[PDB]
Amino acid sequence: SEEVAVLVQRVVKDITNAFRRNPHIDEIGLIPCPEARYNRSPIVLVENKLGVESWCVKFLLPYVHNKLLLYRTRKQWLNRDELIDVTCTLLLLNPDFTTAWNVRKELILSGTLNPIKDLHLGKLALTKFPKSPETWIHRRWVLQQLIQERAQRLIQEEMEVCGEAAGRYPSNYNAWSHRIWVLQHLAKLDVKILLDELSSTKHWASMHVSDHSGFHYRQFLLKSLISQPHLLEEEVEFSTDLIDSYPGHETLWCHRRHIFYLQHHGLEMEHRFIDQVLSTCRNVEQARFASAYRKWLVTL
Amino acid sequence: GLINKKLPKELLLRIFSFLDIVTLCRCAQISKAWNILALDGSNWQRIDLFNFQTGRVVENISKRCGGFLRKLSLRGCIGVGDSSLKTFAQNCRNIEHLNLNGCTKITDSTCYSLSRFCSKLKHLDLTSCVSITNSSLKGISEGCRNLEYLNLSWCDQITKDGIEALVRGCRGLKALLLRGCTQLEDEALKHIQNYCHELVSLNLQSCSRITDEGVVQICRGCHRLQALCLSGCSNLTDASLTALGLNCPRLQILEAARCSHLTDAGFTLLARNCHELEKMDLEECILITDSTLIQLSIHCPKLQALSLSHCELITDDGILHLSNSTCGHERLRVLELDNCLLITDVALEHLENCRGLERLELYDCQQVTRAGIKRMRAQLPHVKVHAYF
Amino acid sequence: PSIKLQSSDGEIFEVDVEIAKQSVTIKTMLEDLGMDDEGDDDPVPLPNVNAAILKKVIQWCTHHKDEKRTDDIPVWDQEFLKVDQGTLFELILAANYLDIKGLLDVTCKTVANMIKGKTPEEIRKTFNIKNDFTEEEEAQVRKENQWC
Amino acid sequence: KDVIIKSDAPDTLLLEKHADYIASYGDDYEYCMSEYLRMSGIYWGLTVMDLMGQLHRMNREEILAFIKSCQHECGGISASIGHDPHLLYTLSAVQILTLYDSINVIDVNKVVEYVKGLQKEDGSFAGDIWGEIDTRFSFCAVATLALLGKLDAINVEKAIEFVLSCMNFDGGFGCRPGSESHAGQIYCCTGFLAITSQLHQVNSDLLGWWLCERQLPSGGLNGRPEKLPDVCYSWWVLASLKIIGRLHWIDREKLRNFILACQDEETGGFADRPGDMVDPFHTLFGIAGLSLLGEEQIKPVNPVFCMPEEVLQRVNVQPE
Ligand SMILES: [Zn+2]
């Protein structure tokens, strides 16, 4: 009860020292390990991955959680180094703890936290909590401080982080929401970025046919290109191929709707596609979605 | 009330001496006895504010107290900015102790107020007052020349030019804390040894620009040093260790975590001339071998607390020496041997002679068994030993 | 390494000399005493502490090997100090007489905690202090001291 | 793609077990993992209990003390003691206080000042001082102010205009302009447009069409295309359809069977989906959804505010 406090401090120290030994750590995970059976740290570093042995987490999060609250509540002081390290450990364990992120915002405003350090923190928490809403929210707050070419390196690292978080979590709304935001506020809808994203991301959509967030992101790319032809046609053909190769995905038929809606700013070709689909299809889901597409089609 | 019948004024004031200002004002409303007690001078001596951000309090205390405010802690009161502290300063000229730790909205403007109105300051804590520049140290050097204690921790935009201005006026500093002032270099160390000959305590943690040139100078200029922190100062060598031994016979505390280059040569020279060492933190002094501990067991009879974390080369041998120290038989209480991979159960049997040990750390010492721990706890129930088990 | 202590009422207590020199007063008396071979092994006289208070003190000293602030008391001490008001005041006096700064801090912080978080009449009720202020004076003081 | 309802799925409402479950709900590790939303957790649990005629089972006084102890000097309310204030937990605490008719145990004026202060010049609202924009916050803002009778305290026309710029061409809404449409967000905006009397700028046929395609063959509702059905998204989709009067566009019976199939017959509580573990969050939305489909053992629920309609009538009959 007092031997545990020492242990939790030790494990906090072990996490910080992991990052000194390897500042290229790029992933964290929980190592299922309910028993402390040897005198080794529960912090296991193998190559670039940082594993945390589960037996210690039941001690580590309540202590670091309450340390942060006792600080915030003005009953126990933490200095700058401890703030940074206590909140680092909390966000590794529970990145939806907004108060923990908010303490780093202040540390960043005061100048003692390099913002780039929080971009790395979020990136690593996102390897374990890819949908974490607060982490994305914090990450946008940091990014907007850094805009008040380094932009392109930021934009480019956001695309990869969002890509990483989308591959780790099915239909990751928050990852793609963040990716949209970045386009809006960091790239300000730069037409060549929208183009490079449209091409980079066609591969990813090919591989994630049931993921509607990814297709909406392509929908966003195209609409935003509009607001500044061959791209729409090539997106309908892409949808024709995907619908044909992977019958029965509501995401693909929903994508074709959105994309065909934009192209319509003719419908016989789309009727015959629905006719040809419904005549020769074995998938029962595919028939639902094709019949559903036509009821949508005729209200035009 | 029993309280008044059994406890005399001297003790009642001790009770009230633990009370916030809000609670102290309510006791003033209890009785005529408790009124004279609630407002007695000794209760308005020190204020530690534990309040809400949304300030005027510091300004209202400045009036209700005024002349007798001597110590004022505002640690973590992000509410306060220059305006409140101007008002408090012009009303509390006898203040001897000001703690502004973490008060982030503090500008050069308040050190100017302090210079104008608080010439009796002996203790200024500026930890994490990030908006403070070199100019603040110039103002403090003009109006706060009796300063004995200054803490600039994590005041990262302070440079050698501020340090120079500060010590050129505050020649009487006995304690100077500069942790996390990463722009400080050897010239700033040289301004310190030039002017702060009465320096007892110096913190240079994470001031990793400094080198032996600066540290050796500090030892030449500060012969009264008792406490020195150089953790994170990777550039240092045994040369700084030789200069310490030669110049600082009163050394009690030496923190040199992460100083990789330090070797037995340095520590033998240090040990023989420094017979008053009590704390030594040598975490990640990898080159250190059992020989370093040998000299410590001979030449350091009052050694109190030793960290050998990550000193991989340390073996059960050096631990036997420590335990057969004059310091080990009674005056060692804290020993940290974690990530000393060679330490075994035998070292825990050695340290059964250390009847004074309160705290033993063995994290990542994989040769150490649950059995060894249990028999050490059994011989020394005084000791809390700490491993991952 | 054990000494005998005699309380005010004549009961004698065997106490280890180490846990007992947490008392600066007791350590003083030992230093004053011998250094004596030829005595009658008389205990250390403690005329200003009775056996019940001593008991509580020795138990407090055995449990310990080991800022205007009261949220600070360890939980063993909090439990230890859940006594009637009379004995806790006696423990303050004892801690002061015997100069046990740890015990005098927790006990004073404990009485201080009984005052915090209450209204003036909640104070006078806890400690049965008679309010000797007229409404004129009570209104006044809840005047100056009111700022807040 | 979907769940399959087993032949032994609960087909009737087990009100007493749900009230026992919520009444005994309550470990230290996972208490800390959840504390960042404690206020709303309490709102789910109190609200389902009052919908079930069981609110008296709960400790009114420790709740009100907790809320009183969560208002910061800026006026905003945090999820727990010592957490930072956020609009989400200010809505929750105000909902809780509305259930307990104890709105005035906190400083209503400073709550109003806190909400008002989060609006931005384009009409949008931030969730707290740090400035995250979300239509969920436009909803939380007007819901809190409506409950306090203080909708005039913000710029309503700007707030409406902003929310309308989040309308997608598919009829839905997301967190911001350009966002993917999303049932939870559609619920917030729909609820926003109901509190502020602007539902007529919504193409009800478009939105209700997007919404009714959330029903899967199992009867359950998902939150977006090709997601599993979910009790919580079932409630938000059902609530939205009620608000826009397109509730006849889903099969209410199959959805009722889906929600009922999410009860645990042994423990009480609803899971997100049959087979999964129950929690108080889905317990509220399961019971609220059933009240909306016509379960007469449950008090009628308001679709905008997720509270007993009786509690909002008490609000709407006043100075107001
Ligand atoms: Zn759900």
Swiss-Prot record, chain A:
Keyword Lipid metabolism among UniProt keywords: no
Membrane-spanning ranges: none
PFTA repeats: 83-116, 118-148, 158-191, 197-228, 235-265
Sample GO molecular function, one term: protein prenyltransferase activity
Pfam families to which the protein is assigned, alphabetical: PPTA (PF01239)
UniProt superkingdom: Eukaryota
Record keyword Transferase present: yes
Keywords from the UniProt entry: Acetylation, Prenyltransferase, Repeat, Transferase
GO cellular component, one term: mitochondrion
PANTHER family linked to this entry: PROTEIN FARNESYLTRANSFERASE ALPHA SUBUNIT/RAB GERANYLGERANYL TRANSFERASE ALPHA SUBUNIT (PTHR11129), PROTEIN PRENYLTRANSFERASE ALPHA SUBUNIT REPEAT-CONTAINING PROTEIN 1 (PTHR11129:SF3)
Family: Belongs to the protein prenyltransferase subunit alpha family.
Record's protein name: Protein prenyltransferase alpha subunit repeat-containing protein 1
Annotated source species: Homo sapiens (Human)
Swiss-Prot record, chain B:
Posttranslational mods: Phosphorylated by GSK-beta (GSK3B), promoting recognition by FBXO3, leading to its ubiquitination by the SCF(FBXO3) complex.
GO biological-process terms attached to the record: modulation by host of viral RNA genome replication; negative regulation of NLRP3 inflammasome complex assembly; protein modification process; protein monoubiquitination; protein ubiquitination; proteolysis; regulation of autophagy; regulation of inflammatory response
Signal sequence, start to end: none
InterPro entries found in the cross-reference section: F-box_dom (IPR001810), F-box_LRR-repeat (IPR050648), Leu-rich_rpt (IPR001611), Leu-rich_rpt_Cys-con_subtyp (IPR006553), LRR_dom_sf (IPR032675)
Pfam families tied to this protein: F-box-like, LRR_6
Location of the F-box domain: 1-47
Record membrane topology: Lipid-anchor
Subcellular location: Membrane
UniProt keyword Phosphoprotein, yes or no: yes
LRR repeats: 53-76, 77-102, 103-128, 129-154, 155-180, 181-206, 207-232, 233-258, 259-284, 285-310, 311-339, 340-364, 365-389
Any one Gene Ontology molecular-function term assigned to this protein's record: protein phosphatase binding
Domain remark in the UniProt entry: The CAAX motif is a signal for the geranylgeranylation of FBXL2 and is required for its association with cell membranes and the recruitment of substrates to the active SCF(FBXL2) complex.
General remark: Deletion of the F-box domain creates a dominant-negative protein that inhibits replication of hepatitis C virus RNA when overexpressed in a hepatoma cell line; this inhibition could be overcome by NS5A coexpression.
Name of the molecule in the record: F-box/LRR-repeat protein 2
Organism: Homo sapiens (Human)
Curated annotation (Swiss-Prot), chain C:
Any one GO biological process: positive regulation of ubiquitin protein ligase activity
GO molecular function, one term: beta-catenin binding
PTM comment: Undergoes autophagy-mediated degradation in the liver in a time-dependent manner.
SMART domains: Skp1
Record-listed Phosphothreonine modification sites: T119
Biochemical pathway: Protein modification; protein ubiquitination
CDD domains cross-referenced by the UniProt entry: BTB_POZ_SKP1
Cross-link Glycyl lysine isopeptide (Lys-Gly) (interchain with G-Cter in SUMO1), sequence positions: K130
Listed GO CC annotations: centrosome; Cul7-RING ubiquitin ligase complex; cytoplasm; cytosol; nucleoplasm; nucleus; PcG protein complex; SCF ubiquitin ligase complex
Region (Interaction with the F-box domain of F-box proteins): 92-148
Record's subunit section: Interacts with KDM2B, forming heterodimers. The KDM2B-SKP1 heterodimeric complex interacts with the PCGF1-BCORL heterodimeric complex to form a homotetrameric polycomb repression complex 1 (PRC1.1). Component of multiple SCF (SKP1-CUL1-F-box) E3 ubiquitin-protein ligase complexes formed of CUL1, SKP1, RBX1 and a variable F-box domain-containing protein as substrate-specific subunit. Component of the SCF(FBXW11) complex containing FBXW11. Component of the SCF(SKP2) complex containing SKP2, in which it interacts directly with SKP1, SKP2 and RBX1. (Microbial infection) Interacts with vaccinia virus protein C9L.
Family: Belongs to the SKP1 family.
Name the record gives this protein: S-phase kinase-associated protein 1
Organism of origin: Homo sapiens
Swiss-Prot record, chain D:
GO cellular component: cytosol; plasma membrane; Rab-protein geranylgeranyltransferase complex
Record's keyword annotation contains Zinc: yes
Disulfide bridge map: none
Source organism superkingdom: Eukaryota
Catalytic EC class: transferase
EC numbers: 2.5.1.60
Repeat (PFTB) residue spans along the chain: 15-53, 60-101, 108-149, 156-197, 204-245, 252-294
Keyword set includes Repeat: yes
GO molecular function: Rab geranylgeranyltransferase activity; small GTPase binding; zinc ion binding
Alphabetized Pfam families for the sequence: Prenyltrans (PF00432)
InterPro entries listed in its UniProt record: PGGT1B-like, Prenyltrans, Ptb1, Terpenoid_cyclase/PrenylTrfase
Residues the record lists as binding geranylgeranyl diphosphate: H182, A183, G184, Y233, S234, W235, W236
Catalytic activity entry: geranylgeranyl diphosphate + L-cysteinyl-[protein] = S-geranylgeranyl-L-cysteinyl-[protein] + diphosphate
Note accompanying the cofactor annotation: Binds 1 zinc ion per subunit.
Annotated keywords: Acetylation, Metal-binding, Phosphoprotein, Prenyltransferase, Repeat, Transferase, Zinc
Inhibition and activation profile: The enzymatic reaction requires the aid of a Rab escort protein (also called component A).
Residues bound to Zn(2+): D230, C232, H282
Gene Ontology biological process terms in this record: endoplasmic reticulum to Golgi vesicle-mediated transport; protein geranylgeranylation; protein modification process; visual perception
Gene3D superfamilies, per the entry: 1.50.10.20
Family per similarity comment: Belongs to the protein prenyltransferase subunit beta family.
Described purpose of this protein according to its UniProt entry: Catalyzes the transfer of a geranylgeranyl moiety from geranylgeranyl diphosphate to both cysteines of Rab proteins with the C-terminal sequence -XXCC, -XCXC and -CCXX, such as RAB1A, RAB3A, RAB5A and RAB7A.
Protein name per its UniProtKB record: Geranylgeranyl transferase type-2 subunit beta
Gene behind this protein: RABGGTB
